[PDB]
């Protein structure tokens, strides 16, 4: 309404933009038993350390990885519902470097994004998934356990959570108010930063198209600003750039870099908040670090189960 004489700005570019970030490598992958490559990103070879070259248009996705991990992508690919697995836990070929690789379904295939993991050790790998989950089950409960009719001490609970959590420098929920334009209310920030609590910010910082994409994909990770996107090498039947709107590496919007880049935000982790309308995007759990941050799949899947609760328990107090 406010923001109507945008139309659907930014949407097509955001979607479809061709860049994802350079901590990971994207591929995609036909969907009909083949693994045959129909995209990649130009830094997949490089990560997977393996420079007819292996990492090409239509060569089989399989022999990209260990054979145990093949296995795993064949089971992944034939599953009734391909979210479930996420992420698997697979190994390059050559080097057994491992990565998490997190799966989705697009129009052309299966999109796999590998986000190499900061451990070979498979327990301590456990052992960071089983924290994070047990830490989301406990911030639920803490939340639950909580005396109603108190919004603002969910959102500074909430906002305490997600910082021990993450371990992001700021974390911030910004709520939307009634003209779109958002405020700060609630902080929990390493303590030699200035605070953004109660600040207010115009409308235009988030448009349409972004909040829009909040309802289907809740939790977005930039791990730095400064990071120059890297290109998607695609099969050239694909009529129009591969859509990387699912991916966990789709690289911000130059103007959103530049915006992170100025306010120094180097890492960012933002969740929506979600609420009954069938649903409206109430606000934003913002993470900030001031340097380069990705934290593991697992930890982001426990913090997106943490918000799916923060959005029931705020809908419940609000129709309360
Ligand atoms: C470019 C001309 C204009 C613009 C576009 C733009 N913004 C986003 C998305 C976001 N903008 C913000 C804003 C804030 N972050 C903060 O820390 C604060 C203070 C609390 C604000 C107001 C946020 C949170 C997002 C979401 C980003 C994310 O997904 O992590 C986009 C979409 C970017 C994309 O690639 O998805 C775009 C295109 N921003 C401007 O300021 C210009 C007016």
Not at 46 to 58: K, M, W
Not at 81 to 87: A, C, D, T
Not at 244 to 257: K, N, W, Y
């Amino acid at each position: 309404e406010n923001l109507y004489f945008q139309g659907a700005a930014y949407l097509s570019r955001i979607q479809r933009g061709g860049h994802i970030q350079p901590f990971g490598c994207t591929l995609a992958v036909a969907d009909d038993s083949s693994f045959r490559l129909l995209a990649f990103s130009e830094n997949a070879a490089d990560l997977l350390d393996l420079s007819p070259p292996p990492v090409s248009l239509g060569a089989d996705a399989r022999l990209l990885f260990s054979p145990s991990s093949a296995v795993l992508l064949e089971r992944a690919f034939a599953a009734r519902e391909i979210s479930l697995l996420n992420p698997l836990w697979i190994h390059s070929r050559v080097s057994s470097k491992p990565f998490y690789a997190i799966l989705h379904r697009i129009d052309v295939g299966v999109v796999i994004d590998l986000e190499p993991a900061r451990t070979e050790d498979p327990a301590l790998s456990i052992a960071g998934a089983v924290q994070s989950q047990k830490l989301a089950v406990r911030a639920i409960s803490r939340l639950q356990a909580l005396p109603g009719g108190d919004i603002k001490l969910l959102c500074d609970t909430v906002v305490e959570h997600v910082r021990e959590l993450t371990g992001y420098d700021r974390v911030m929920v910004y709520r939307f108010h009634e003209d779109e334009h958002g405020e700060v209310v609630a902080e929990s920030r390493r303590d030699n930063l200035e605070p953004y609590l109660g600040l207010h910010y115009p409308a235009t910082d988030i448009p349409q198209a972004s909040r829009f994409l909040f309802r289907q994909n809740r939790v977005r990770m930039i791990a730095d600003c400064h990071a120059t996107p890297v290109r998607v090498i695609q099969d050239p039947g694909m009529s129009q750039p591969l859509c990387l709107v699912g991916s966990t590496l789709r690289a911000p919007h130059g103007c959103h870099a530049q915006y992170m880049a100025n306010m120094g935000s180097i890492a960012s982790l933002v969740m929506a908040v979600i609420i009954s309308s069938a649903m409206k995007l109430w606000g934003l759990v913002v993470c900030h670090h001031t340097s380069p941050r990705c934290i593991p799949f697992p930890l982001r899947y426990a913090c997106e189960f943490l918000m799916q609760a923060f959005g029931l328990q705020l809908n419940m107090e609000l129709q309360l």
